[PDB]
Amino acid sequence: STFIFPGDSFPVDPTTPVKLGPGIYCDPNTQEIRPVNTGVLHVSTAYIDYSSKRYIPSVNDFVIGVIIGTFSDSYKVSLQNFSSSVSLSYMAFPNASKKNRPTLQVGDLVYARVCTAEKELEAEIECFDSTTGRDAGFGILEDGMIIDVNLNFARQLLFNNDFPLLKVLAAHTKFEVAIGLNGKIWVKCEELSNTLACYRTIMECCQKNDTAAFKDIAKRQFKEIL
Amino acid sequence: FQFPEIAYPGKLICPQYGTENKDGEDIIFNYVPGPGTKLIQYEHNGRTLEAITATLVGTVRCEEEKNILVSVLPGFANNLPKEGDIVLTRVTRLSLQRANVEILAVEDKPATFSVSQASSDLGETFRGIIRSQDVRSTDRDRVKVIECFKPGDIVRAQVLSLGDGTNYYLTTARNDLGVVFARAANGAGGLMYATDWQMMTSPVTGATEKRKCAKP
Amino acid sequence: MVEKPQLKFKSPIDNSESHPFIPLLKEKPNALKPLSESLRLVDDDENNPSHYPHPYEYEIDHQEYSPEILQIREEIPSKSWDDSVPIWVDTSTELESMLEDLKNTKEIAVNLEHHDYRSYYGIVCLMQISTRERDYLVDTLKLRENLHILNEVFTNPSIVKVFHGAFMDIIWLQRDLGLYVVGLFDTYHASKAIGLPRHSLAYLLENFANFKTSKKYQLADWRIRPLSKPMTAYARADTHFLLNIYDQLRNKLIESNKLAGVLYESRNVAKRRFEYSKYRPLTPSSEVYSPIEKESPWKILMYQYNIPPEREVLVRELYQWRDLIARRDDESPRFVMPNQLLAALVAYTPTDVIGVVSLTNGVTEHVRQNAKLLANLIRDALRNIKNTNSETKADGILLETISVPQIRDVMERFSVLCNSNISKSRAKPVTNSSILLGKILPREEHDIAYSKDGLPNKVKTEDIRIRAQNFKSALANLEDIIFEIEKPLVVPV
Amino acid sequence: YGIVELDPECQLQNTVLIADLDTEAEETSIHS
Amino acid sequence: TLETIEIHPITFPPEVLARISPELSLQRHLSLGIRPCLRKYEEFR
RNA sequence: AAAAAA
Numbered sequence A: 001s002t003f004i005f006p007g008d009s010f011p012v013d014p015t016t017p018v019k020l021g022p023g024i025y026c027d028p029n030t031q032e033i034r035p036v037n038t039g040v041l042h043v044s045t046a047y048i049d050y051s052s053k054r055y056i057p058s059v060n061d062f063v064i065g066v067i068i069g070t071f072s073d074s075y076k077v078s079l080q081n082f083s084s085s086v087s088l089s090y091m092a093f094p095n096a097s098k099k100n101r102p103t104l105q106v107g108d109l110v111y112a113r114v115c116t117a118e119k120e121l122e123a124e125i126e127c128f129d130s131t132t133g134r135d136a137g138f139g140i141l142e143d144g145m146i147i148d149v150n151l152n153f154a155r156q157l158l159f160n161n162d163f164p165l166l167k168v169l170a171a172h173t174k175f176e177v178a179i180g181l182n183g184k185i186w187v188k189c190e191e192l193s194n195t196l197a198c199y200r201t202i203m204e205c206c207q208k209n210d211t212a213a214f215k216d217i218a219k220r221q222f223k224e225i226l
Numbered sequence B: 001f002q003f004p005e006i007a008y009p010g011k012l013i014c015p016q017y018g019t020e021n022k023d024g025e026d027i028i029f030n031y032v033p034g035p036g037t038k039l040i041q042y043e044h045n046g047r048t049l050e051a052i053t054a055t056l057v058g059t060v061r062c063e064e065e066k067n068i069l070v071s072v073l074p075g076f077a078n079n080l081p082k083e084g085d086i087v088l089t090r091v092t093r094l095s096l097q098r099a100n101v102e103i104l105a106v107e108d109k110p111a112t113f114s115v116s117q118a119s120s121d122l123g124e125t126f127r128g129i130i131r132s133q134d135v136r137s138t139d140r141d142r143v144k145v146i147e148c149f150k151p152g153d154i155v156r157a158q159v160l161s162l163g164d165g166t167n168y169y170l171t172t173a174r175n176d177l178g179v180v181f182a183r184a185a186n187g188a189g190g191l192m193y194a195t196d197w198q199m200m201t202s203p204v205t206g207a208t209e210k211r212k213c214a215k216p
Numbered sequence C: 001m002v003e004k005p006q007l008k009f010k011s012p013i014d015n016s017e018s019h020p021f022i023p024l025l026k027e028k029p030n031a032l033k034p035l036s037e038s039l040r041l042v043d044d045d046e047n048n049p050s051h052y053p054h055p056y057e058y059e060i061d062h063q064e065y066s067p068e069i070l071q072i073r074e075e076i077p078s079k080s081w082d083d084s085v086p087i088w089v090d091t092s093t094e095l096e097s098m099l100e101d102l103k104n105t106k107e108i109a110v111n112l113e114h115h116d117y118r119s120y121y122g123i124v125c126l127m128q129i130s131t132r133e134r135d136y137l138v139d140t141l142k143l144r145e146n147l148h149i150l151n152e153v154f155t156n157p158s159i160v161k162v163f164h165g166a167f168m169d170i171i172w173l174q175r176d177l178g179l180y181v182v183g184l185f186d187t188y189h190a191s192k193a194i195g196l197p198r199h200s201l202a203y204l205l206e207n208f209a210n211f212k213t214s215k216k217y218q219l220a221d222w223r224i225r226p227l228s229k230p231m232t233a234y235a236r237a238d239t240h241f242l243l244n245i246y247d248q249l250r251n252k253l254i255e256s257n258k259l260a261g262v263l264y265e266s267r268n269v270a271k272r273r274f275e276y277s278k279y280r281p282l283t284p285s286s287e288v289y290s291p292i293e294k295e296s297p298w299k300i301l302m303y304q305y306n307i308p309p310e311r312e313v314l315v316r317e318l319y320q321w322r323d324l325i326a327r328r329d330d331e332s333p334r335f336v337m338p339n340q341l342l343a344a345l346v347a348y349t350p351t352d353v354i355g356v357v358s359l360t361n362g363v364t365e366h367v368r369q370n371a372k373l374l375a376n377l378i379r380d381a382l383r384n385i386k387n388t389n390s391e392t393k394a395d396g397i398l399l400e401t402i403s404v405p406q407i408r409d410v411m412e413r414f415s416v417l418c419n420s421n422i423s424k425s426r427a428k429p430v431t432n433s434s435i436l437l438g439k440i441l442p443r444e445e446h447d448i449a450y451s452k453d454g455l456p457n458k459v460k461t462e463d464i465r466i467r468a469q470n471f472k473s474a475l476a477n478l479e480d481i482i483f484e485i486e487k488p489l490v491v492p493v
Numbered sequence D: 001y002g003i004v005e006l007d008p009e010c011q012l013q014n015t016v017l018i019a020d021l022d023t024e025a026e027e028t029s030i031h032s
Numbered sequence E: 001t002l003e004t005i006e007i008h009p010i011t012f013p014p015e016v017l018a019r020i021s022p023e024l025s026l027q028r029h030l031s032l033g034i035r036p037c038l039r040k041y042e043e044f045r
Numbered sequence F: 001a002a003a004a005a006a
């Protein structure tokens, strides 16, 4: 693998046009491209994969947020603790209305995507994609349980279909699941013992971080509750 | 003027009312207090008396407008943002429906300016808010605030209404108002200059950012 | 099109407002106070003029609720939505059957439907009443003057009436149908007491019922007969599960001791009295409803569209005429002329019949025929505004009030004041020589420049002066930065 | 002492060493 | 061919330039070999 | 310191 360090020279020649991305920084004065994080450089597209527990607002990202406040203009939703609030408009719901407002209390789990996210402006999310049949699991998440994981474990789970988690958990139990890019995973089952079994697995899988240890953990966790 | 030219705080200048004889008719001079003066009450011969008394050390000026105005000019405080004045401000934060700033200097009248000295790391500096509808006369309804102003950019505006005792309400609707001084990437890059009214370019790194520019 | 039921009514509409609102109540069942004693008129106060009071005002307050509303009973599940069917009542023969059917019930859920576009006061269209095991849909068009017999059930304190937002329902009941409610329980006010996020009906059918609905047919015309499938779906859905929510909310209130407050606010809703805009109280209240609660209703119209206080006489006549025609042909003021089109008449002011017809998007029917008259009202208003078309003055009378020789007196008393005050001052001259810190503290700023030898050299005070003169001169006039950009797309002549 | 970098677009009428910093401009803008 | 376009830099009084920007007020001084306190590069107090 | 009916 090719490991990258901040401040190091950029291997990619400046001759051929290359689109930017997360992980690299374009100097507003010297106009030189330099890495600002530590990880593996992926060139297809140029970006850097680095370990981070803190999520930042970005366009077209699926996130699971919690309503921390209800205003007259929009909703105040926290995608993560201590981070700045996000603006969820009333018109950001399917079958929107003028006078009539969507029913959401403080503490309700919402599965939405980030539409407009500026660095110097308050981010905004919408409870309907733009668009994928208006139903990618978007909306209020009733009951269930959520778990905090690092951003590395969250993105690989949602995007990569070769990740042996949804594959190994589907065999142990039948359930619906929603994964956000802010390190939040929402899983709901029928019986509470199944949800608890799923929580303990992801908690241990994220800690150990091993692709081939998924089946081993899931086997001993589901047999522990019985 | 038959009245003392130099006046220290507490020095008597002129009584309440005055009159003179000219052209076979009595002309009534009405003395009114002004900046640096204060109408107070004195006692003498067992009888009350009201007279204009200077409260600031400086020279006395008697002027008339289309009545005699008595004011004392020192050798800032008097200058305060009022409806119609032009004010140089700096962007403190950006929201979606508006843009709040802080007042630095105020344009005088016939350029010269009056710099308001205050601590910017406390919040004692006067704060002002520019509404999204007050950005430009062109398309007042839909205006993208991100493509107009920027944190740190200097904006020349004109105050409409003072509102409450917290924030001032400015506007950049006209041509001579808008972002004056700004740099690339929120101040990280080089200096940028105003070319088009809705476009600001930088003749150094070749960077171009969308702002609300004024007329040179 | 659709024929208005006003012509099909046994009694013609009266938009005269020449007399205070007289209740259409004929028989007064379940009342301990005689009708003749409540048919009188209240004494006129400063704000309240002469008017007929609420008939059951003495019945609503004094009467007691059934002791079974004060106990916590288990919820009663609503009948199956797909299995149960709504019963339509369009004849008096099946109205009597429903009347005796409501008398053997403990509580009923009632909600109204209204249309205010083809009528001035508006007209009650559909009334949906639902019990525990069945639902009803009562037509208030054909059956209107005969619905007064429902007061036996509606004014009975033993039977609990379950409404939602009855603040407008009580008005519509007593105005058109002459119905009154004694023993009301408004689920809306109950939702407020609990602290529910939304006090709407769609939320109560969601959280406490799990029956997803939506606002589709509300402003829609309900006068159309017969009723379609999605309309009759929304019609019955209002009062169907309403009895289920009634028990659930009632149990919430008892354990939280908030039941006394809800029934209190419910009675105040049931005692709401309708009255015309003319004979309305001068003091605005929530106990008396009227179409216009402001003495000058054209005031708020101007401030909304930024109309200056000059064309007020124009917008007044345009408003009064719009109300005159609306009360003539029995139509809504917006149907005669919308506010947006009226604004075009105030802003543009067409002096001819050509400028009146063609404005904005479209023009309604009422102002099209009277467009010639509208051209005259503008010419009359412009004639009126042109018919009507103290600083030193107020001071001058005050200067002649005070004595003129007194000015010479107060000046002499001023001259003798200064000469006997500031003119006398004698003290031995004392040097301002420094005692301690007076030598070093106010020290003038000096600068030094070390040379190649390392010897300190005092910078002249004139040196820094020409430095400022050089800077202020160079900064005042900046050299215009000129940079050229290639343009291969441009061509010469 | 301080060390600053010059900006060509701010000329009137490549680092420079400054001695004895003072006021607000030399204190806040100079990070060396 | 070539398109020559000039721009007019907005100038401010010396006391206003300092309030607007601390760096800009310093650069204008350093260009003439002077400092905001009206001293040269190596001039002390 | 928005809210309910139609």
Ligand SMILES: [Mg+2]
Pocket (backbone or CB within 6 Å): C111, C112, C164, C238, F005
């Ligand atoms: Mg209803």
